[PDB]
Design a protein around this ligand. Structure first.
Ligand code: FAD
Ligand code: CL
Length: 416
């Protein structure tokens, strides 16, 4: 046993785990499949890396819908503000942008990766690139060895699994970690994509009626209800995309899986600022100002023209009908479609194409203060391989950095 701790995976969690263990005085090996460490980290935040989020604790947890509450213990030890200080000290100043989102002053993800690599070098962590792991050996409820794809055996009593999820496999995250966890006794929460476009075969989608149409600042709901507020949506050839749709997508997936229906209902509130009474009266007070003018001109500007004209048809209103020859029941209907237009949807894009993989190693089986397995001694987990996931805004890297630091410092401590 040359190595006190072996960390498998050099994403943000693995890099923090290796630093965490080496600070505890352990001789640490960090293994990665790729020719470079931090490939996904290097593309994160549009190439700038949204490293963390400075919002208060309770808001951070709320933005991590996949087991955010599990992180309460971790955050007591090492939290968002601690992340900011940590990076400052490694010479990579951060800045705050919108909605609490923190980015390097350099505006370059590579800056973050390089700082972490420099700290590993300073601490004497051994790094082996192009070194894929095949499996982990366990005996007597304890970790015994890491087995490389080549067959090379690396004996150790402390292994940190930091290999990420299943999305964007070109970066190295191909779901290798789940089988190792199962071998160790763990359950895997069923995997689902997050932040992906939603599919629909509604006739109006198939006939491209609204294709390319952006609806700005809408409320998009998944009915049963889960609601994304004041975000933009886009109608595509295949369904719904844009921030509002992407946010709802994990909820579409779960629902379809739980229930075994072919479609589920979504609802679009195109004008969330205004209630159906205010909107109805707005519309009357305009139909009276110009009762001889065509309704398609009297009521322009409420929603984009293509959506407007589609909804008129749907409600059997001739756009050229005189504003004072349109029945008030048919206007009430138009207002209901402005506030709650239903769209049946029937799936989403795949996990390969997702932002983050939802599901993973169950956190019920992990000691929250340690990131240690409850089943196998000398086994630790961190990052996206765990069943933790965040919305966009820095939350996923927050969790990876935090869990990686706790897992690493616990391993390094245990190994001594
Ligand atoms: C396009 C994109 C942009 C993103 N932007 C942000 C953002 O701005 N902010 C944010 O908070 N989140 C962002 N995310 C998500 C965030 O990048 C991830 O959640 C995070 O990188 C997960 O960190 P990790 O350490 O768990 O795993 P990863 O970063 O996925 O790293 C895992 C490492 O494990 C290695 N590995 C895998 N299998 C093996 C094996 N068998 N043997 C050896 N090594 C192996 C891989 O080569 C890889 O280097 C983004 C995601 C995507 C895809
Ligand atoms: Cl993000």
């Amino acid at each position: 046993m040359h190595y006190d701790v072996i960390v498998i995976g050099g994403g943000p969690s693995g890099l923090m785990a290796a630093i965490g263990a080496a600070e505890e005085g352990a001789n640490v090996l960090l293994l990665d499949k790729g020719n470079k460490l931090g490939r996904k980290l290097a593309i994160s935040g549009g190439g700038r890396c949204n490293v963390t989020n400075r919002l208060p604790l309770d808001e951070i947890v709320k933005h991590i819908p996949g087991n955010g509450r599990f992180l309460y213990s971790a955050f007591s030890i090492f939290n968002n503000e601690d992340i900011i200080t940590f990076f400052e000290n490694l010479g990579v100043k951060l800045k705050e942008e919108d909605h609490g989102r923190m980015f390097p002053v350099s505006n370059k993800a590579q800056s973050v990766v390089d700082a972490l690599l420099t700290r590993l070098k300073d601490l004497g962590v051994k790094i082996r690139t192009n070194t894929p792991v095949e499996t982990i050996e366990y005996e007597n409820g304890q970790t015994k060895a890491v087995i490389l794809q080549t067959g090379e055996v690396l004996e150790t009593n402390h292994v940190v699994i930091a290999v990420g999820g299943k999305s964007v496999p070109q970066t190295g995250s191909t779901g290798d970690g789940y089988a190792w966890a199962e071998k160790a006794g763990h359950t895997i929460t069923e995997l689902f994509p997050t932040e992906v476009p939603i599919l629909s075969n509604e006739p109006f989608i198939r006939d491209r009626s609204l294709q390319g149409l952006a609806l700005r600042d809408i409320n998009l709901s998944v009915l049963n209800a889960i609601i994304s507020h004041k975000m933009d949506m886009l109608f595509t050839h295949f369904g719904l995309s844009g921030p509002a749709a992407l946010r709802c997508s994990q909820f579409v997936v779960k629902a379809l899986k739980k229930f075994k229906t072919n479609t589920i209902q979504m609802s679009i509130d195109a004008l969330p600022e205004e209630n159906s009474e205010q909107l109805f009266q707005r519309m009357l007070k305009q139909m009276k100002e110009d009762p001889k003018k065509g309704i398609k001109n009297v009521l322009k500007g409420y929603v984009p023209e293509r959506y407007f004209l589609f909804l008129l048809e749907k409600n059997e209103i001739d756009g050229s009908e005189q504003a004072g020859q349109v029945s008030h029941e048919k206007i009430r209907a138009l207002v209901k479609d402005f506030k709650e237009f239903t769209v049946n949807v029937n799936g989403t894009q795949s996990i390969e194409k997702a932002f983050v993989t939802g599901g993973g190693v169950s956190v019920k089986e992990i000691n929250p203060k340690e990131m240690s397995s409850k089943f196998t001694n000398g086994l630790y987990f961190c990052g996206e391989v765990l069943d933790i996931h965040g919305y966009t805004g820095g939350y996923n890297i927050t969790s990876a950095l935090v869990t990686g630091r706790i897992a690493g410092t616990t391993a390094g401590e245990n190994a001594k």
